[PDB]
Ligand binder design. Sequence first.
Ligand code: A1ALS
Length: 166
Amino acid sequence: NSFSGYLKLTDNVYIKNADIVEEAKKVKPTVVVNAANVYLKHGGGVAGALNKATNNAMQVESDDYIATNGPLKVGGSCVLSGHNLAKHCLHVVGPNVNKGEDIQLLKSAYENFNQHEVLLAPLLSAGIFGADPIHSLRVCVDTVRTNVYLAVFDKNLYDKLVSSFL
Ligand SMILES: CC(C)[C@H](Nc1ncnc2[nH]ccc12)C1=[SH]CCC1
């Protein structure tokens, strides 16, 4: 968990302008969080980038999990292997607000982080799911109580988050 170059926002939330895949390769954290969907189909965004970096081993494992357990609920999670990127991957489903899913489920999504002492994570629901990224960071800060290191792969968005926060 050798995180470097983060800015501490609160007692337990840190943030960096970085690709989460590059962070995972350098740090080999105990847990990396995936911004997943309910069927664990890693087609784009953070999910597609993490899966590509495992050479599709994450997708093969996810398909087997879904066959045996069924889909996750919105706001839910499962713990699977982190493959070459981390000890574990915590797959978390935030609401797709562009498709009418309730934004209050973003609090339930972030609550899953509290089962792990230290996590490398992305900003939930901030991609194609359509939540305001600054609102997602506010819910993270007011929900997560364990130590989370947020990687945001966009310098313009990073600067807007840090200006709004501090
Ligand atoms: C908001 C956006 C810049 C961010 N993308 C990323 N954040 C961190 N590492 C990344 N690697 C590849 C994409 C990527 C997302 S997509 C879904 C949730 C958060």
